[PDB]
């Protein structure tokens, strides 16, 4: 029978179980419940990682040191193993024999206590072919009688949905709700456990490192409770140091190592940015300007907002940024966002809001459609953010989306979190939200039927106000109005489109060199203010790609290149010369 | 895959909850990373602490099959833990770990493989290298917050074009011998 039950008090003598710190009120109630003449069976109900298994085992630990009342002294605690109890019980009566034999020794001792971890498993432990004979029905008369004392442990999900379904078994137990300790209490717990973790990794943890692990975990590590969250960062930090090369090995765990661990656990950038990343931010704006010509104000808003986040000046309850890039066509509202992801090397979450025109399809970002029993549930936007917390979230053509989509982004832009239907929470604190719309292009473009031309370019904002609710616009960090491309800007665009063409030709081995005068001709021919810079692509396609297409497939341009493009002033037309 | 592995060695060198989970998409090398860790040990391309370690690949299908009894599953599964508990260096590679959360053997009960390994994983007795997809990680896994706590997710991202050509060059001898062909360097790119 000893194979099924492990004496926890023995482990305490050799140090098998870690010490329990605090929990004076939680533990005290357990003693009161155990002392009870009747129904002396406490139940430790709490979320995962809140010390449910450290209290029952910690009680045994306290007994060895004599830090418990005289009544609790001289009382051993046994931990039951359901797996061993149900091992090789094929024949009828085997399980009952093992279970009843255990209960008999407990009643005889009169000072023994049983600890059943994950007690939700005894409901149907011994049921066979629909049989109702289970550990719960067997133990029941011994709990109601009060002969034996049993300590339980189960999560709220399991307790409410499985353990509390049997209204008889639950009556016998006494739920002791355990609440996660405060930040102040958690650091004390780490100090108590720090000697064991320090010995295992042969490292020393600075007092500042302990406080940082707790404070940083809450700030960044979500979906896990504080005692586990902090111990996870501490244990992982020690391993990182122990296994790195002996040369440059550092026994002490400075506060900087803690920050690096939290970053990898949460997949976010680390605090106290390094010199290498500092160079990226210094030249982040100047790199985008090379790719995107004009509209520097937009780049200044994105880069400055990112710097604040990486400098510790963030909102702490909102995303890195929320910018509504409202502007005319072909002004670089989407190019800057696609290049930003490349510049920062972070995943680009691109959502085309043209699809989400009606409410039935808007429930795909936070949940699954009704009746979708398929296991592939979850929102498209919540799952994506969870996979990549550091990323760029682009919602193109946000105006086309049903107005109800603006209500979803309110919490994202104010609280920084969006919850899935299942209850999972996504953190937007590191995502650069960017929206692109053409709400006011027509209004400003609109001509005025009057003797005096109207002072346009003001009504554009008034149209944006009508499309977007005031609450949505208040949360926004800045509404960037993209201006129209000028003649000088278009010249740079032609260069940008020629470089891309050169790259395509480089794959085939062809080399292209456009005369500077010829580039000016292309720019003037295609320059359109209303159509932005997209027409420049078309003139590049008609003037250059169309003639070369026939030559590449057949002719001198099969390989070798040696192209020489120039224009004729007399004819105002291009001259293409290929010599392999 | 030294950046991903290094993280896994850190998790496997922990006092408690030393069970690295290789979460990722489908086809991004989740299984190879775990089986690769064994290949690297044989050649001595791993730290000293990781040396003298064996990786066991669990087969839930074979284990569950043939039970036909109340305690057959528990008997064979518990015996496996004794082997892993006695051998401190033994590591268990449970591929498609999402399956253990669902009742493996139990029917109308909660005595599953997941609820049996939780006590051992919490105390650091045995290490477990799990592998699961992102869709399975969200909807099958993470529904039992207790088990998810024991496992430290290690996101595995798709490799770049340049990184993959190195991979093909590494695996080119295996396919060359099987097909008796020679893949040109330009062809793989």
């Amino acid at each position: 029978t000893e194979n099924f039950t492990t004496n926890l008090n023995q482990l305490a003598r050799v140090g098998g179980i870690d010490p329990l710190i605090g929990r004076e009120k939680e533990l005290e109630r357990a003693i009161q419940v155990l002392c009870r003449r009747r129904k002396n069976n406490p139940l430790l109900v709490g979320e995962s990682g809140v010390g449910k298994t450290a209290i029952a085992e910690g009680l045994a630990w306290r007994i060895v040191q004599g830090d418990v009342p005289e009544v609790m002294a001289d009382c051993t605690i046994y931990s039951l193993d359901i797996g061993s109890l149900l091992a090789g019980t094929k024949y009828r009566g085997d399980f009952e024999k093992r279970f009843k034999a255990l209960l008999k020794q407990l009643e005889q001792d009169t000072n023994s206590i049983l600890f059943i971890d994950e007690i939700h498993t005894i409901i149907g432990a011994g049921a066979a072919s629909g049989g109702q004979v289970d550990a719960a029905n067997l133990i029941k008369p011994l709990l109601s009688s009060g002969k034996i004392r049993v300590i339980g442990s189960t999560t709220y999900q399991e307790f409410s949905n499985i353990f509390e379904k049997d209204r008889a078994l639950a009556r016998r137990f006494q739920k002791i709700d355990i609440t996660e300790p405060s930040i102040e209490e958690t650091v004390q717990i780490i100090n108590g456990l720090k000697p064991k973790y320090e010995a295992h990794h042969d490292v020393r943890y600075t007092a500042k490192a302990v406080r940082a692990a707790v404070e940083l975990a809450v700030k960044y590590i979500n979906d896990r409770h504080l005692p586990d969250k902090a111990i996870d960062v501490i244990d992982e930090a020690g391993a990182r140091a122990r296994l790195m090369p002996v040369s440059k090995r550092k026994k002490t765990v400075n506060v900087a190592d803690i920050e690096s661990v939290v970053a990898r656990i949460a997949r976010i950038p680390e605090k106290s940015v390094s010199q290498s990343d500092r160079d990226t931010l210094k030249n982040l704006g100047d790199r985008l300007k090379m790719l995107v010509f004009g509209q520097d104000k937009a780049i200044e808003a994105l880069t400055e907002a990112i710097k604040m986040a990486r400098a510790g000046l963030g909102h702490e309850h909102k995303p890195v940024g929320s910018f509504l890039f409202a502007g005319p066509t072909g002004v670089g509202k989407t190019e800057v966002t696609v290049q930003l992801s490349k510049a920062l090397g972070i995943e680009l979450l691109r959502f085309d809001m043209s699809e989400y025109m009606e409410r039935h399809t808007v429930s795909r970002l936070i949940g699954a459609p009704p009746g979708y029993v398929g296991f592939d549930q979850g929102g498209l936007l919540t799952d994506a953010v969870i996979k990549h917390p550091h990323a760029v979230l682009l919602l193109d053509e946000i105006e086309k989306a049903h107005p109800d989509v603006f209500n979803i982004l309110l919490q994202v832009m104010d609280n920084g979190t969006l919850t899935d239907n299942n209850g999972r929470k996504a953190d937007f604190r590191n995502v650069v939200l960017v929206m692109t719309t053409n709400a006011g292009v027509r209004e400003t473009e609109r001509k005025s039927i009057g003797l005096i031309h109207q002072d346009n370019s003001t009504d554009a904002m008034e149209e944006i106000k009508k499309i977007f609710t005031p609450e949505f616009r208040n949360r926004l960090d800045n509404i960037i109005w993209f201006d129209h491309l000028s003649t000088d800007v278009i010249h740079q665009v032609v260069d940008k489109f020629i470089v891309e063409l050169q790259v395509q030709l480089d794959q085939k081995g062809v080399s292209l060199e456009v005369s500077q005068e010829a580039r000016n001709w292309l720019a003037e021919k295609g320059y359109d203010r209303a159509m932005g810079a997209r027409p420049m692509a078309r003139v590049i396609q008609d003037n250059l790609k169309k003639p070369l297409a026939n030559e590449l497939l057949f002719g001198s341009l099969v390989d070798g290149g040696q192209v020489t493009v120039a224009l004729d002033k007399e004819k105002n037309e291009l001259t293409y010369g290929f010599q392999s | 895959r030294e950046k991903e592995l290094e993280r896994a060695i850190q998790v496997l060198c922990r006092r408690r909850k030393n069970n690295p989970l290789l979460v990722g998409e489908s086809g991004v090398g989740k299984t190879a990373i775990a089986e690769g860790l064994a290949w690297r040990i044989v050649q001595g391309d791993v730290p000293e602490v990781m040396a003298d370690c064996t990786i066991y690949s669990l087969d839930i299908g074979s284990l569950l099959a043939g039970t036909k009894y109340r305690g057959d599953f528990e008997k064979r599964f518990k015996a496996l833990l004794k082997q892993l508990e006695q051998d401190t260096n033994s590591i268990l590679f449970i591929d498609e770990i999402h399956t253990i959360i669902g009742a493996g053997a139990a029917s109308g009960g909660q005595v599953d493989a997941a609820n049996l390994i939780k006590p051992l994983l919490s105390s650091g007795k045995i290490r477990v290298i799990g592998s699961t997809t992102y869709q399975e990680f969200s909807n099958i896994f993470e529904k039992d917050r207790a088990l998810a706590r024991r496992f430290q997710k290690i996101d595995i991202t798709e490799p770049s074009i340049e990184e993959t050509v190195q991979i093909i060059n590494g695996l080119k001898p295996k396919y060359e011998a099987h097909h008796d062909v020679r893949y040109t360097a330009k062809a793989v790119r």
């Binding site: 094929k90 024949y91 009828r92 049921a127 066979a128 072919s129 | 036909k68 009894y69 139990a106 009960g109």
Partner: peptide, 11 residues
């Protein structure tokens, strides 16, 4: 499923 079998020893 989980069925209990009663064995019979030889006489």
């Amino acid at each position: 499923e989980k069925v209990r079998d009663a064995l019979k020893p030889p006489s």
